[PDB]
Amino acid sequence: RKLAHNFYKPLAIGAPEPIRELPVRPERVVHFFPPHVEKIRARIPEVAKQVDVLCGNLEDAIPMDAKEAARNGFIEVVKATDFGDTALWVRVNALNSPWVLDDIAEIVAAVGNKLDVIMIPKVEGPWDIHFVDQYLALLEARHQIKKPILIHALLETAQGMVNLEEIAGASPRMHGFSLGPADLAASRGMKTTRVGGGHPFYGVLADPQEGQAERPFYQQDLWHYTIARMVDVAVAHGLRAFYGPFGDIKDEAACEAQFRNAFLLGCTGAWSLAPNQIPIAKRVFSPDVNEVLFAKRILEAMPDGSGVAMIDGKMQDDATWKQAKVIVDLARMIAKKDPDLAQAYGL
Amino acid sequence: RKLAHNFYKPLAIGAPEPIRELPVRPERVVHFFPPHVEKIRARIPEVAKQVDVLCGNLEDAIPMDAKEAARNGFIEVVKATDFGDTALWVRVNALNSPWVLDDIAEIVAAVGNKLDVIMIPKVEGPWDIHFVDQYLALLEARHQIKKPILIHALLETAQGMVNLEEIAGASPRMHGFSLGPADLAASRGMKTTRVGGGHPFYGVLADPQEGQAERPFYQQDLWHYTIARMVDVAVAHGLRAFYGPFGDIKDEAACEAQFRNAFLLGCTGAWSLAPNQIPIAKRVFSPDVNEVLFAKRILEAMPDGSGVAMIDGKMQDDATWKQAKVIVDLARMIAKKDPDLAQAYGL
Amino acid sequence: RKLAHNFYKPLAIGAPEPIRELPVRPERVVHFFPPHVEKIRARIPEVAKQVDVLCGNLEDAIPMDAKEAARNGFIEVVKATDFGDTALWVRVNALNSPWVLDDIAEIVAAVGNKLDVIMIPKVEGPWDIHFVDQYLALLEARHQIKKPILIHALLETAQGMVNLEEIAGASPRMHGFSLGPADLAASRGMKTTRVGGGHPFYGVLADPQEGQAERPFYQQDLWHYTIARMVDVAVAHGLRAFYGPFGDIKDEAACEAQFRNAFLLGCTGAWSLAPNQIPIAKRVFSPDVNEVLFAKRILEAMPDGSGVAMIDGKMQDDATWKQAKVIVDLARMIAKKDPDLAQAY
Amino acid sequence: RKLAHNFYKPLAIGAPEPIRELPVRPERVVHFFPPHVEKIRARIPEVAKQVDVLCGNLEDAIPMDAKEAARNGFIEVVKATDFGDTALWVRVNALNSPWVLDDIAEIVAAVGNKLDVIMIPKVEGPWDIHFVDQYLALLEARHQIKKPILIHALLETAQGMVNLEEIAGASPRMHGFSLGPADLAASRGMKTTRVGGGHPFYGVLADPQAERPFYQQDLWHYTIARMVDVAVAHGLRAFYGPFGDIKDEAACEAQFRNAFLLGCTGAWSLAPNQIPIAKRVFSPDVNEVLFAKRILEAMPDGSGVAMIDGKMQDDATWKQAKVIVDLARMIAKKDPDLAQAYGL
Amino acid sequence: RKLAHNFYKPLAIGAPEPIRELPVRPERVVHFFPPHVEKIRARIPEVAKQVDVLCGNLEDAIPMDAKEAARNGFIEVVKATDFGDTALWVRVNALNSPWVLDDIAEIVAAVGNKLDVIMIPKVEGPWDIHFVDQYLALLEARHQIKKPILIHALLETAQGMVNLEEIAGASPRMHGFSLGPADLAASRGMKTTRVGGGHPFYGVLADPQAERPFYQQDLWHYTIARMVDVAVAHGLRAFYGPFGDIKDEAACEAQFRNAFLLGCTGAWSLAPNQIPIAKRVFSPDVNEVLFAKRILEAMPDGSGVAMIDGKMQDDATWKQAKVIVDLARMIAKKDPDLAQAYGL
Ligand SMILES: CCC(=O)SCCNC(=O)CCNC(=O)[C@H](O)C(C)(C)COP(=O)(O)OP(=O)(O)OC[C@H]1O[C@@H](n2cnc3c(N)ncnc32)[C@H](O)[C@@H]1OP(=O)(O)O
Ligand SMILES: CCC(=O)SCCNC(=O)CCNC(=O)[C@H](O)C(C)(C)COP(=O)(O)OP(=O)(O)OC[C@H]1O[C@@H](n2cnc3c(N)ncnc32)[C@H](O)[C@@H]1OP(=O)(O)O
Ligand SMILES: CCC(=O)SCCNC(=O)CCNC(=O)[C@H](O)C(C)(C)COP(=O)(O)OP(=O)(O)OC[C@H]1O[C@@H](n2cnc3c(N)ncnc32)[C@H](O)[C@@H]1OP(=O)(O)O
Ligand SMILES: CCC(=O)SCCNC(=O)CCNC(=O)[C@H](O)C(C)(C)COP(=O)(O)OP(=O)(O)OC[C@H]1O[C@@H](n2cnc3c(N)ncnc32)[C@H](O)[C@@H]1OP(=O)(O)O
Ligand SMILES: CCC(=O)SCCNC(=O)CCNC(=O)[C@H](O)C(C)(C)COP(=O)(O)OP(=O)(O)OC[C@H]1O[C@@H](n2cnc3c(N)ncnc32)[C@H](O)[C@@H]1OP(=O)(O)O
Ligand SMILES: O=C([O-])C(=O)[O-]
Ligand SMILES: O=C([O-])C(=O)[O-]
Ligand SMILES: O=C([O-])C(=O)[O-]
Ligand SMILES: O=C([O-])C(=O)[O-]
Ligand SMILES: O=C([O-])C(=O)[O-]
Ligand SMILES: [Mg+2]
Ligand SMILES: [Mg+2]
Ligand SMILES: [Mg+2]
Ligand SMILES: [Mg+2]
Ligand SMILES: [Mg+2]
């Protein structure tokens, strides 16, 4: 790992100074779109208004022959639009691919000053970050980019999971991680073709019952370990953790349950793959109204944030005050964008 | 990490020789109390007789205007009391706080010889342990303290979780870890104000059954990964793992369930925050009666702990013998201290 | 770790060149047997035809006074048998035991060319692998063994769990890990005498219900973290992860459930401790017929594996194609060996 | 090592923000003095005028029965003296000693805002730094100290040498290292009672031909070379410590000059007579500066190639010249007598 | 590294408890001998009384057809000889060799209770130590060896040099290192066939003035310095190995003395004539001892400052004096002339 004094130095003469703190903004939903699709490209300004984060996709789900068209279409649509409060991301192709050199180079060259975050897929170790870091720096210097483009690592290989700490601390550009359950399941050899959510085969069988009686089967979460480890490593490095894609577009109930699990565990947001998933992500990664109301009571009960208090037979202290603050701070930020939430939150 | 031949050397001339083995004693319940509260302080010698471990608290839940009074109150009651077989701990203030230097110094000066374990909150890395170890050594030398004061690390930050191995191996003073789910939730940004236990928002949704409305929702353990990792790292380093606080004081059913989960995963004990939680912790972290009996039958079927056997259609061998021995060894040392459990097992 | 340019060098003059890739073969079931039992030994050649892997056991479950007999028994049944497609493993005694030196030396001497994998119990760190690697190499050189004997590490100590990465990367002999739930519980101090499976005491209690209706209690998986970590570390190092023993031989339903959880999480196979467990492991650690069918639909929807597609409301792309490929490739591989799975798949 | 974003955070609420860059100042000579000696103490403000750095000594060479007197003496003289451009250091007792807790606490409490650097003796590993860093932070917060007190590690154990990288990166307080050849020789078991300098027993015998030449070798080459690399790689400074033979000024100067050539910033003086030796040696030689100027002139933009007296110059030799000239320039503004000799 | 609480545990049930501290004894000379050569084997009990350490050699210099003869010869002479206070070592064959398994197993089985130290050649990393440590434990348990056989690592590969720290901390059996300049030169590709000592081609050419002076340099400075630091940091001892030029005793003494100065405990002797050279060189010089006694007498408690012969002394030089005088006492305890020479 790099020395702290060198960690914050630009990797190229003319490259912008590395940031010390991550930009604070709502990131409840990261909306993916295929930039090579004209009808979708046409409604981008409309969509951008309704999402915290917009992410152009160049990698998986983009057909091999459409790669160049996706890259160009992203550049085309970005040059045309003012995204305002909406964050702009892009997932370029893999580091071993014949498209990645031009993806990064041409995008930075054209719209580098509008690009907030670049997502790198199939990350396996800190060496991957080292390349992207130095490559971006040289491109930023060449094209006079005013602020550093951040790196978001898609967490979707067994290697990536094992090397998570090393990846997280590899660069000041690091923004966070997205769990990619599809590639990760394939890499691990998890015997499923689903993308997130539960699986009926994973459960605990109860002991034999009093008199022959049928045995309850309790489904378990496939992703507990993975999300928990991702959150810990990310947060410890000052980064953010995201749930990635939920593949079953039509099963909105399961999407919500999976999103909510991630939110509870400490994830900032999730991807949306279609318009229907957009309100699900925003609704889930906004704190529940009852959570906020009770949190406000904790903050009020201990105004200085120090000491002890009892609310409804539940003990409160300095720590629960900090828990409440996390919820309320987030709720406050969001309430500025959604009138109805502000009304519900009273913030 | 220090070399083995230096690891066991005292860090100050006149400081007592570092321990090679942790003291063997029941630690089923760690009872917290606020030392600045006269009404509670007056009953302390009475409470001490009913707990395996008594722990004064100077950190969170103590109002900032009562910090010095709490420190003084703790010292006062300790000086006046013979704790007998009851272990004495204290949770001092955080390493970044204006109270910590005096917390440790005054407690060692006045009652260092009575103090078994010091609990350090908000631990982030091995550097924290290094400071406390060297500080304790110099204070022990200063006051001719006869046995080393051990260090118990409160596990309640994201950095602490990630650096757990390095923390565990940083000192021969290390006693173990307590899970602090309130600060840990806040640190990770887990979206709850609860302190331990289940959450109705975290669960797995069953698949949609065509023609049926009900989709079972199976609640999941928020703390599986956390406790499992804590237990592995602690035990691998010869240390003990504990569950910390259960915040919902009145929900004794949920408290017992949370305590029992920790016990099953290998935790030695849990904190009690009020008298009602004392019998719960003692009951849970004492091996259950039929568990002991079946273990006793395993030890009988293989007197030397070597070979194979079947009991009730269940295969037994050297390893299940070791499993039984763990349960039976624990039952014995509790029975020596607890009269009611002495007869419930066999003594 | 050793340097890459030394990692693949033999540790003794005359020892065979280290493998670069793990041998590809079905390993759905690892059948354990006590080699000192003549009755069982006589049936071994028959049993071997039904299992992917046969593993002789010299360690736990073998009485002290039978250690020598078990070692000789294993050697003798191996000398007399052509196992064919069945892989041959042996679990020797622990590295601190008075039997391990002779276990490894005598087995290599007599049947080293027939032994595929040696299982080492109670592994604690990379130092354990370093000893076995170097000892095996000198024995291989001594008896001119033609291919490297692989090391399978039993994962059954807290130290082993914590040092898993180092153990995994310690030798080119590494084959994989088996979860040893019994010793691991005893090592951790998990308060149970059960060997795998659920425990009724481990669950999440629901919130107070309303008019104080009984509070639902949801049992949890004791082994989730353990198996998940084993799978990640193994696969990242190019190794395979296995569920070990399920101690309740009579409870076939709980056995199958435990086996299936391991399979879902990425485990390659499980142990069988008795013949009744053999078909359970083979059934579970083969992809379910419905899994394969939907997987085939995915592969068919975009044969080059590059693009996007919708199937039954579920979105598909390059990654789900790779998921399907994992399932289909394993399906075909087993089908060529397990006749029922050819027509069915 | 700590994470970068946490590395630069104060370790106590109210402690001053950790520095990102080391203060720039001449540090050619670090003058040691026993603060418990009244006659020395009385002469302190005069001696301070002619040294770059003044360092009070509480550790070795201070008798056990004088430890507290030394502590109080240091505090007394510091409170009463305006040191000006002279940096103020103190070498406290070892981390295992019965004096160190009070050494650090009482000095920080009384004169922390005047203390630039604290020297810790017999450092063995990063854990030592972690303790001092956290201790200082809490003391700094308690007494509202305005700037961070830096940590200078005495390199004088074999363990410290082996753990040099870990020590160097342990804290943003790190200032640098001093070689303590006496303790280091004893730690290693180097069979000499000398403190720095050469030893006639260390040398290479030529092949037979008559009379075989015996070439003396530098005992300290490896040690100083390693110290400089580790120090410089971490943005720290490396120092030669004491030269024990106070009277042998020729050998002192030779040892000092070796350290300076290898990259050391300065050396200790243990007596007034060593003061001008250190200042002379750790200031660039006049001919070194002159030739460096020739290089800077032949390379007005610092890039390209050139030839001076059969010696090839380029971007790198320009940087070498810049190191020389920049140092000469900084010293010149502090020393008028060197300004015209240098021509700066 | 292993955890501290497991580091000191026997690796086999029945193996003796690992040592916490190295045995204290003179180890100035490590005398090598080919145990297969009969006429040498008959003089062993005589030579044994004249050396601090006797080391049988089974590896390099022993021809292949004599490997088994060497092993058997070692066992035979050890069985018959009471070595008294002379240490008994054996250098077995390399870990990749067809001889090592039996070298270790048979020797432990036959004379394990007389064997103090086993030397492992061609060590490349901690994995080598791990194997030998575990192998020995299982052999010790089987044959009921009462005290642990220690491991001495021959430092003679580039990889060994680089992994020195990991090797040093790999086992409580570790005794120390010997520099093997022959294999190390071949391993590094140092362009010479000499075994230790100087080389006329390695030197520094002075600037033009007259004929330019050429100062020969020590090939082994870095190597020995690094070995000493790593060894001592882990509480181990460093040794110089073979000086291959048996007849050039002056060059041998010079090489040996360089090692002694840098901190090496002893050296190997390959022939009878090297025995007195090693014993002489690795015993403290009389003047070193006499001067070290004055420092100890000047500061009886080892605290404070003093002044002798214009040389300043303090706690640190007292410690240096202590290193020298302690060693002298041990040697004087079995050598009357040095006792009277040293005046103890
Ligand atoms: C598993 C590992 C991974 O890599 S997941 C990440 C990669 N995946 C993606 O980005 C997938 C994005 N989604 C899509 O491409 C489309 O949703 C696909 C799957 C092709 C479906 O196309 P289509 O059949 O037109 O959907 P539809 O009839 O339901 O759409 C209705 C209207 O919505 C639009 N729409 C659809 N998706 C998006 C989107 N991501 N962003 C913006 N608009 C979208 C459609 O174009 C359609 O628009 P309109 O009503 O016709 O104007
Ligand atoms: C979550 C993050 C954390 O840091 S948790 C760890 C820090 N927290 C603590 O230590 C909390 C300690 N507990 C307390 O201060 C009290 O229990 C609080 C929370 C204030 C509740 O007080 P109270 O409402 O009086 O409880 P209660 O009604 O159950 O009291 C019954 C009787 O027992 C006493 N009591 C109470 N707590 C303790 C205690 N910890 N130790 C000893 N005695 C205790 C009460 O004084 C009361 O006495 P009585 O019935 O009036 O004779
Ligand atoms: C938990 C920690 C660990 O170390 S577990 C790994 C170590 N344990 C083992 O290897 C256990 C091996 N298994 C056994 O010893 C037996 O199966 C035990 C468990 C004792 C049960 O014996 P039993 O009750 O007779 O089994 P069964 O009724 O099912 O016998 C049916 C026929 O099959 C035979 N059989 C039994 N076990 C095996 C075996 N492992 N391999 C091959 N054959 C086996 C029985 O002898 C019986 O034979 P048959 O019909 O009479 O010809
Ligand atoms: C080797 C391992 C280590 O720890 S070295 C670092 C620790 N040692 C030290 O700090 C040594 C400091 N020096 C001293 O104590 C003295 O210089 C000692 C060694 C005692 C020698 O005294 P002396 O013979 O009087 O020296 P000298 O002839 O050069 O003195 C001439 C006049 O100079 C004065 N002087 C001496 N040292 C200092 C000093 N460090 N700072 C200021 N003034 C000093 C002396 O007082 C002396 O005049 P006077 O007749 O002593 O009054
Ligand atoms: C360079 C890399 C390495 O591996 S060095 C470490 C391995 N080398 C060794 O151990 C070499 C040991 N030495 C020897 O074998 C001999 O000294 C060699 C070099 C072969 C020369 O033998 P030779 O010429 O017969 O010796 P010499 O005439 O000088 O001896 C006179 C009397 O001394 C004897 N001697 C000789 N060497 C030893 C010895 N190492 N130990 C005991 N005795 C030795 C000779 O036998 C001779 O005795 P005697 O007069 O016949 O009773
Ligand atoms: O790309 C992804 O997000 C995946 O593989 O799940
Ligand atoms: O301090 C604690 O125990 C916590 O935060 O849960
Ligand atoms: O040996 C085993 O497999 C175990 O202990 O579970
Ligand atoms: O203190 C010192 O500088 C020494 O020991 O050389
Ligand atoms: O074996 C040795 O000592 C050598 O190679 O120099
Ligand atoms: Mg993917
Ligand atoms: Mg807390
Ligand atoms: Mg086992
Ligand atoms: Mg010193
Ligand atoms: Mg050699």
From Swiss-Prot, chains A, B:
It catalyses: (S)-malyl-CoA = glyoxylate + acetyl-CoA; (2R,3S)-beta-methylmalyl-CoA = propanoyl-CoA + glyoxylate; (3S)-citramalyl-CoA = pyruvate + acetyl-CoA. Divalent cations such as magnesium or manganese. This is Malyl-CoA/beta-methylmalyl-CoA/citramalyl-CoA lyase. Its cofactor is Mg(2+); Mn(2+). One of its GO terms (biological process) is carbon fixation by 3-hydroxypropionate cycle. It comes from the Bacteria. InterPro entries: Aldolase/citrate-lyase_domain, Citrate_lyase_beta/mcl1/mcl2, Pyrv/PenolPyrv_kinase-like_dom, Pyrv_kinase-like_dom_sf. One of its GO terms (molecular function) is magnesium ion binding. The keyword Lyase applies. It comes from Chloroflexus aurantiacus (strain ATCC 29366 / DSM 635 / J-10-fl). It is an enzyme of class 4 (lyase). The gene is mclA. Mg(2+) binds at residues 156, 183. Transmembrane segments: none annotated.
